Antibody, heavy 217, light 218 residues
Framework: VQLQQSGPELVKPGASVRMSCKSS????????MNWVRQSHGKSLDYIGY????????GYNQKFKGKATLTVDKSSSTAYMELRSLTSEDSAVYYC????????????WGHGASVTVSSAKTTAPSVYPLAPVCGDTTGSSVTLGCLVKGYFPEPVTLTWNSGSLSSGVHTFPAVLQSDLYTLSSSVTVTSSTWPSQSITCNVAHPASSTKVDKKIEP | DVVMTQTPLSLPVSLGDQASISCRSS???????????LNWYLQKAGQSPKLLIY???NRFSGVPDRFSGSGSGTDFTLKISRVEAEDLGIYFC?????????FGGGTKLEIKRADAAPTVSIFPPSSEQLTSGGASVVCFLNNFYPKDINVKWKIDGSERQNGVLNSWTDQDSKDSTYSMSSTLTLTKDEYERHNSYTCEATHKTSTSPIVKSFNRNE
């Protein structure tokens, strides 16, 4: 039993997204395809079920209207259409199959992420972060770098073309309204900066962007 | 809707330890056809959920002997006998007796260690950004343990809210410590007419809030 799901989409606000899920190799059984939304990290919300053989759907009363479940019996292809997408609906959506008796989701698809955003490809602004701020802790200097207002993801950041790889902490991006923002920090010994060069490297392939910010003193 | 409440919310273990996760429904799960339909899942790091036990104690295929489930009615437990490293991730409990299916919030298994104190660092907006017309003051609270930390932003004595973007690292696979970032974003105009900026961390290791400050020129 294998389930293939259509991968990521970027939907506009007040729009709809149709999502597919093909079941394979558990031919002849009466089993159901299930859709489960995972809001962010830990809340799983059961959306509904549909039998590809008979057509028996059943929704969670919270999603009826937001979500329309359909199947092409003839292909074993379930569908979920979500309409009037709001920023709030930006989650991962799983497809999984159950098989009689027990009633557990025993086989799961890989997930479908939907980012609901009104942005077109937006290039980031890369800002050096020099710790002038609150003077060195003695032995260590921590430097940062801030990547602001980019759509879609990802950007990639490395320090000194990845020659600097220890004491780097890169923070997950967050959809700052309808754009993303992420940062990273590197901790070097106090003799190193600025006697040695530390440079923030960024490339946002979705917009041809590559930038190098030497964090000048 | 049956609320599935699950405790702990986070369970720190050393590899090799016993672990138990409790889960209670708000109604009995004993169905009319005679069955209590309570299942358990593990979603390891960024993977899909994986069924471990169904109908409270039935181990699914390929799930080892270490993992067990038990209970009745309203009260259930998932037990691990030796937390091997492979087991670390979020476990949820789902009920399928009553409509709709619901799930608990999950119990994050994590590696326990000695409390660390945040290495706070605050960063003034960059020339570049102030030239853009905007100003982010960033504050990295690198490498603390436990993850319950509390960041506040203060500008000139009143506390600050509009403009804080907050994010976080998961347990680093090296030193078991978390790191989180705070960024306050205001106008060049409002930055220029204010002067002390305070990233004021509260962590459970110090009674004393960790305060990194700077003054735009003071």
């Amino acid at each position: 039993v294998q389930l293939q799901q259509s991968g990521p989409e970027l939907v506009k606000p007040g729009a709809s997204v149709r999502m597919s899920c093909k079941s394979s190799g558990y031919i002849f059984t009466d089993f159901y395809m299930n859709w489960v939304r995972q809001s962010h990290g830990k809340s799983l919300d059961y959306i509904g079920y549909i039998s590809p053989y008979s057509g028996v759907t059943g929704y969670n009363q919270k999603f009826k209207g937001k979500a329309t479940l359909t199947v092409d019996k003839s292909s074993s292809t379930a569908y979920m259409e979500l309409r009037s997408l709001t920023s709030e609906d930006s989650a991962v959506y799983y497809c999984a199959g159950s098989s009689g008796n027990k009633w557990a989701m025993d086989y799961w698809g890989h997930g479908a992420s939907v980012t609901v955003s009104s942005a077109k490809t937006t290039a980031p602004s890369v800002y050096p972060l020099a710790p002038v701020c609150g003077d060195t802790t003695g032995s260590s200097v921590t430097l940062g770098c801030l990547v602001k207002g980019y759509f879609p993801e990802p950007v990639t950041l490395t320090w000194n073309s990845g020659s600097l790889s220890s004491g780097v902490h890169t923070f997950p991006a967050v959809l700052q309204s309808d754009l993303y923002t992420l940062s990273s920090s590197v901790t070097v010994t106090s003799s190193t900066w600025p006697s040695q060069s530390i440079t923030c490297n960024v490339a946002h392939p979705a917009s041809s962007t590559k930038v190098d910010k030497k964090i000048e003193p | 809707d049956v609320v599935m409440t699950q405790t702990p919310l986070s369970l720190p273990v050393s590899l090799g330890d016993q672990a138990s996760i409790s889960c209670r429904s708000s109604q009995s799960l004993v169905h009319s056809n005679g069955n209590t339909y309570l299942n358990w899942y593990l979603q390891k790091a960024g993977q899909s959920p994986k069924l471990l036990i169904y109908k409270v104690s039935n181990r699914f295929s390929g799930v080892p002997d270490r993992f067990s489930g038990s209970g009745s009615g309203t009260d259930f437990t998932l037990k691990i006998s030796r937390v091997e490293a492979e087991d670390l991730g979020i476990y949820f409990c789902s009920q399928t007796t009553h409509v709709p299916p619901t799930f608990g919030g999950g119990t994050k298994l994590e590696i326990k260690r000695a409390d660390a104190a945040p290495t706070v660092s605050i960063f003034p907006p960059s020339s570049e950004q102030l030239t853009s017309g905007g100003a982010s003051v960033v504050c990295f609270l690198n490498n603390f343990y436990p993850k319950d930390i509390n960041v506040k932003w203060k500008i000139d004595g009143s506390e600050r809210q509009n403009g804080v973007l907050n994010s976080w690292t998961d347990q680093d696979s090296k030193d078991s410590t978390y790191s989180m970032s705070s960024t306050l974003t205001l106008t060049k105009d409002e930055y220029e007419r204010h002067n002390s900026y305070t990233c004021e961390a509260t962590h459970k290791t110090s009674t004393s809030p960790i305060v990194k400050s700077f003054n735009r020129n003071e």
